[PDB]
Amino acid sequence: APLLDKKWLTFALAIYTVFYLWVRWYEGVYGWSAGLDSFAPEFETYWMNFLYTEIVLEIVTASILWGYLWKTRDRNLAALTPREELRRNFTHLVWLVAYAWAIYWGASYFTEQDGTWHQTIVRDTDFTPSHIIEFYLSYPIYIITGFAAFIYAKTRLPFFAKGISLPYLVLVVGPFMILPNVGLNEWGHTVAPLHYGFVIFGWLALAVMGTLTQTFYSFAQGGLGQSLC
Amino acid sequence: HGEKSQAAFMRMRTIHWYDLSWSKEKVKINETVEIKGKFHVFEGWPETVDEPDVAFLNVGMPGPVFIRKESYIGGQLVPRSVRLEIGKTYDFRVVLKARRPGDWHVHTMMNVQGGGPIIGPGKWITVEGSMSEFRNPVTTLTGQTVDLENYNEGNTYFWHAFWFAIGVAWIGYWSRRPIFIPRLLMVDAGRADELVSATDRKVAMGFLAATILIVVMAMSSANSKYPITIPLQAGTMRGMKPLELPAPTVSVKVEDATYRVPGRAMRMKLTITNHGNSPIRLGEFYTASVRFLDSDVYKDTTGYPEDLLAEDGLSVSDNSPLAPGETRTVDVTASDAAWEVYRLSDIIYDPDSRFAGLLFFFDATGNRQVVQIDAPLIPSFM
Amino acid sequence: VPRSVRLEIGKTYDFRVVLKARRPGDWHVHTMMNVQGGGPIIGPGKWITVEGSMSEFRNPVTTLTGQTVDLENYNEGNTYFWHAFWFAIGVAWIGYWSRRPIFIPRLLMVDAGRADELVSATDRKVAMGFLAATILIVVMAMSSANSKYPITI
Amino acid sequence: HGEKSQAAFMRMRTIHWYDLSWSKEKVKINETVEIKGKFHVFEGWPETVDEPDVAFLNVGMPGPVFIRKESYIGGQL
Amino acid sequence: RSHAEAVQVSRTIDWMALFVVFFVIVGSYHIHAMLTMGDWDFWSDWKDRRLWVTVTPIVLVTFPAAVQSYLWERYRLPWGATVCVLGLLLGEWINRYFNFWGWTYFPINFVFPASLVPGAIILDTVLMLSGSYLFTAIVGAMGWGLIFYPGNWPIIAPLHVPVEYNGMLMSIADIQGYNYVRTGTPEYIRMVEKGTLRTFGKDVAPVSAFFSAFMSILIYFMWHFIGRWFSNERFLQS
Amino acid sequence: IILDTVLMLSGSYLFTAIVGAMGWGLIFYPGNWPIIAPLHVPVEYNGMLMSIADIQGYNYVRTGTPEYIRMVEKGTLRTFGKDVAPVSAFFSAFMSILIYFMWHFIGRWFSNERFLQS
Numbered sequence A: 001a002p003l004l005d006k007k008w009l010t011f012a013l014a015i016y017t018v019f020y021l022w023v024r025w026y027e028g029v030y031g032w033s034a035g036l037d038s039f040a041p042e043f044e045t046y047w048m049n050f051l052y053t054e055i056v057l058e059i060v061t062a063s064i065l066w067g068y069l070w071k072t073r074d075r076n077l078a079a080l081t082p083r084e085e086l087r088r089n090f091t092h093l094v095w096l097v098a099y100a101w102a103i104y105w106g107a108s109y110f111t112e113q114d115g116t117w118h119q120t121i122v123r124d125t126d127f128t129p130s131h132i133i134e135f136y137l138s139y140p141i142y143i144i145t146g147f148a149a150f151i152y153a154k155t156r157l158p159f160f161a162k163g164i165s166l167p168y169l170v171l172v173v174g175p176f177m178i179l180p181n182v183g184l185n186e187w188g189h190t191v192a193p194l195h196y197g198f199v200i201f202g203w204l205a206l207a208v209m210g211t212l213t214q215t216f217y218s219f220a221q222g223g224l225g226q227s228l229c
Numbered sequence B: 001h002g003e004k005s006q007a008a009f010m011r012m013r014t015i016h017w018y019d020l021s022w023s024k025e026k027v028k029i030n031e032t033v034e035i036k037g038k039f040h041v042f043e044g045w046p047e048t049v050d051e052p053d054v055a056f057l058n059v060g061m062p063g064p065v066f067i068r069k070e071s072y073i074g075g076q077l078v079p080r081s082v083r084l085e086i087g088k089t090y091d092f093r094v095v096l097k098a099r100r101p102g103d104w105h106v107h108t109m110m111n112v113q114g115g116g117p118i119i120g121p122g123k124w125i126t127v128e129g130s131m132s133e134f135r136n137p138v139t140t141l142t143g144q145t146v147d148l149e150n151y152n153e154g155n156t157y158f159w160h161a162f163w164f165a166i167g168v169a170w171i172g173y174w175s176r177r178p179i180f181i182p183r184l185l186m187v188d189a190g191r192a193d194e195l196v197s198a199t200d201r202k203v204a205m206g207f208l209a210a211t212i213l214i215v216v217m218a219m220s221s222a223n224s225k226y227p228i229t230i231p232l233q234a235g236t237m238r239g240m241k242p243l244e245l246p247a248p249t250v251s252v253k254v255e256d257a258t259y260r261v262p263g264r265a266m267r268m269k270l271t272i273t274n275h276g277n278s279p280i281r282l283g284e285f286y287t288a289s290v291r292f293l294d295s296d297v298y299k300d301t302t303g304y305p306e307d308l309l310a311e312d313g314l315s316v317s318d319n320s321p322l323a324p325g326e327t328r329t330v331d332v333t334a335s336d337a338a339w340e341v342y343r344l345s346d347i348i349y350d351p352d353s354r355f356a357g358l359l360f361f362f363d364a365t366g367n368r369q370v371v372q373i374d375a376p377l378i379p380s381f382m
Numbered sequence C: 001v002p003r004s005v006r007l008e009i010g011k012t013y014d015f016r017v018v019l020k021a022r023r024p025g026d027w028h029v030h031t032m033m034n035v036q037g038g039g040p041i042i043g044p045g046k047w048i049t050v051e052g053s054m055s056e057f058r059n060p061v062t063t064l065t066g067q068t069v070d071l072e073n074y075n076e077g078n079t080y081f082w083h084a085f086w087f088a089i090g091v092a093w094i095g096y097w098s099r100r101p102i103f104i105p106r107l108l109m110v111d112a113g114r115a116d117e118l119v120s121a122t123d124r125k126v127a128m129g130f131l132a133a134t135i136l137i138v139v140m141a142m143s144s145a146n147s148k149y150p151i152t153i
Numbered sequence D: 001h002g003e004k005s006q007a008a009f010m011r012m013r014t015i016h017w018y019d020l021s022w023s024k025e026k027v028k029i030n031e032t033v034e035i036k037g038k039f040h041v042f043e044g045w046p047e048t049v050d051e052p053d054v055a056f057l058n059v060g061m062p063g064p065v066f067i068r069k070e071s072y073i074g075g076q077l
Numbered sequence E: 001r002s003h004a005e006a007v008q009v010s011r012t013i014d015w016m017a018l019f020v021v022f023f024v025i026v027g028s029y030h031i032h033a034m035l036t037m038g039d040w041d042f043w044s045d046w047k048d049r050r051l052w053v054t055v056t057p058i059v060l061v062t063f064p065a066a067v068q069s070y071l072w073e074r075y076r077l078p079w080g081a082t083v084c085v086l087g088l089l090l091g092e093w094i095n096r097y098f099n100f101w102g103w104t105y106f107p108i109n110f111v112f113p114a115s116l117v118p119g120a121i122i123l124d125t126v127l128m129l130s131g132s133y134l135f136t137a138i139v140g141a142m143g144w145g146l147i148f149y150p151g152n153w154p155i156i157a158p159l160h161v162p163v164e165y166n167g168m169l170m171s172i173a174d175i176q177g178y179n180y181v182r183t184g185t186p187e188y189i190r191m192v193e194k195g196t197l198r199t200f201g202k203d204v205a206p207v208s209a210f211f212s213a214f215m216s217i218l219i220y221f222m223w224h225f226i227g228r229w230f231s232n233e234r235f236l237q238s
Numbered sequence F: 001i002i003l004d005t006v007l008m009l010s011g012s013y014l015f016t017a018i019v020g021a022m023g024w025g026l027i028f029y030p031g032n033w034p035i036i037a038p039l040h041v042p043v044e045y046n047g048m049l050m051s052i053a054d055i056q057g058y059n060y061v062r063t064g065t066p067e068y069i070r071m072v073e074k075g076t077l078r079t080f081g082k083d084v085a086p087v088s089a090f091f092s093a094f095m096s097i098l099i100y101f102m103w104h105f106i107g108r109w110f111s112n113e114r115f116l117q118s
């Protein structure tokens, strides 16, 4: 069995790319056709239904994934073969890759796609197509990925199971608080301070600098270290 | 597309667009449409909106589906912000050029520093053709004729790609050697000197010197290629000419304003006094983008939007010709579906339940007088 | 003018205030103008004598819903009822824990590492019941208030 | 000594001094010189300059080489 | 567990770690930059001499400082600022070509972003050659603030050509912004140079740049310590 | 009681600082609405539309607080009609998640037991 399982990394990259490309195509085709007027029946047909279905599906997927990851926690962690530890570390780094890619798609692409939408329409509704896709789709997706990665690290890696990693907890918690910020974004709308909450909680993502370090140390704990001389 | 959700009192008591006229309703990819008309900054301006001391005549469109060739407020071109006065009528004219094919909702709008957008009536315009046929030529003072759609597209791509390639090469130079993990192991082991060699220092010095030299030479070349440059022009124009409208000869006093709120209708009681020398009949009532007409007195020929035009909405109990010098009290009902569609009923949710509007009085000969109505609005639930 | 107003520097305006007497005594009443950036501007004052009893004062108004209400005693029972109900809930919540030993042996056991023996499953069930009851009561009270007063502005 | 370096648009569109007259061009250590004239606050005032709601009639001199005995705008001191 | 093949395991891990660092930096730096200075980058109407060169370099030391501290102290990797700059540029360009032009059809020469690479390589070289974070925080930050406007001038100069549009003097960037109507941003929102009675004509572009440089020397330093905090490795127990 | 139950059941100060603070911010206005609703009844006072609370404040003269001091909703051109009461509440909730957390650490400072010698 190969040390790194290529198919899971390929699956993560492909599923994220394909789903987000489909979402972008749907936005390009229907946002111009039905998303312009928030009181039209087509807006409810194509965008509010999207929001409701997306919310229910996100809750179901998050609950199922977190439950499955917690239910398969390794009860005894001292009997692990170091090769198995290295394999689990590779899987955790794949989880980190997926979380980074989701962060890119969520905070870099659609957040600015939404800046693009505001310099083309007059007002900032709570449920514009840009908000439906950015606030309620991508942000929860990367939050789910981050929490699942943290749970995987805690319940399957011997180095991370000895306590709650402060950099990891900050990396999975701060980036989340950007979601609660929305309230201030709206309260302010009804480079400006009304947005400095996304700035503050966007910084906590830099906590990856700590988390990655821990990850490397785990790779060095098995035997990689001495062999790398 | 954005006015149906603004406070129905703000919409009523901000600006009062009227006499509007859209030249064409079907343009091509290089044709122009002119949106002329007049606006009246209401005297009882809302108080959570700053006065129009820094305003801007914008156009409400779904992105650049048309380009504003020229915009005039009072005869003068306003390519900048403007200072308007609370209580005056101004004249405006926007000449747009069509970019994208499709059916678009274009609206004139005024943006105000302290309140935001004030959106006027919107019209559907059909653009036929292909986007690739659009051309935007201008002639600079230096003597060059340039198309703004493709001007400076090669230069930006070239310079950004050059800098990105330099950065990628700089990272890839270090990415050819072993990277994070044995580097971290050697750093923790105290071997912080063995990782960096003299060749790396020489390469870094060369990179820094080349970057500085390239930046300086590029700036010199850009200066030589474009010797005549001017700074970015920004300012606010103060001296806009208002319209000198004659004082109306009609006086209207509002005694009771009541609206049902299982309702589409609005009711007022008006005491009207005529001071002119001609008999007069009330022909229209203007509210926040909605015109209530009376077919007996006045008809519409300008081509107002269908959803905002109430052909028979206005009903007056005693709309007989009003003799000069006579005062009389009438009950006026403005009823149209646009009251429900455009969410003028949501005034029930507003903290200030006052309404403003314009009445138009037409004499027998055809002369028209504009009167202002400002009064509190009262709901009726039973 | 039941609200604020914008005046112009240099003009004469006319004003009229109609007041209704509440309390008996000799009072100094003055008209005054309050300004956003300066504060109070007090005019001349006059001594007015009010005779009678305060209990005879009545302030009736008629709402658009068709109800006639006296503003002095309107919504006095409801406020007392709800505030007393919430205070009783809070007092019961504190007194549930106040029936057991309180600060000092609790601190001694906490410092001794016995942080689990203090809280039992019954306390967790009681807390869950309290939280569910609070949420349900708040929601039901809001629904009942909406039903009782459907027309609000 | 300080106007040659101000924005040549500010200078044009702020105040329009005219009808100016300086009594003498050679005074002694206890004599007086009167600078009379009129100004027109332009209607298209620049927008990065606040309106003359709090102004002051000053004199531009290299330090107290002269003392302002009296300054009048409209007849009033 | 391994057998002289550790080399491969390293290389692999390196590639995945490079991916993770690059894209987390992309997301965080892009949201921060857009959320602080986005309006100046969005339009060529805002690329002025006073507030563009003042605000853009001051705000953008934040993430390069922290990433430089982490990647230099622990791995002796000098590309700390360059990777942040490249990630921000990649994110802005992707959105601009696919959303500004692809969705709302604003022209590319109207929505192009600012260039930041030369200053990034300046900062990285300054840190590597001297190996001192204080010498860097002074000299490299000052140079970063100074090199911002000369770096962008070759892209910006052809847009600042005088023109007479309907009787009024304008620049080509001004005509671009006036013609291509943005319903969200009127003209008065433009935080651009407008001129004052204390502003000296030809000394606005340099002085502002110098101001930016000075502020960089502050912000970098501050964020350096922030970069030393997020690089922790503590395991809280609750 | 929501906050206290949230802290006791989970035993985590961070889970509390998020969930309980958000719930505390959200439950504020529904908790007061039964007391406040009868005061928000429409009325026509001398030709102008008012609420019963507004008439109370207008009739019962407070010489210290004029009307303009009232930091109340006045409406804007960006304010959506029926979405003011919820959105503001949500804003409060978010800010609670901050302030609670901060003050938690302050609560860990005043709980010291040090004996300075000067």
Ligand SMILES: [Cu+2]
Pocket (backbone or CB within 6 Å): A114, A115, A118, A124, A130, A131
């Ligand atoms: Cu948005």
Ligand SMILES: [Cu+2]
Pocket (backbone or CB within 6 Å): B001, B002, B060, B105, B106, B107, B122
């Ligand atoms: Cu529209």
Ligand SMILES: [Cu+2]
Pocket (backbone or CB within 6 Å): B015, B016, B040, B041, B042, B043, B372
């Ligand atoms: Cu008007």
Ligand SMILES: [Cu+2]
Pocket (backbone or CB within 6 Å): D001, D002, D060
């Ligand atoms: Cu001089």
Ligand SMILES: [Cu+2]
Pocket (backbone or CB within 6 Å): D015, D016, D040, D041, D042, D043
């Ligand atoms: Cu003048």
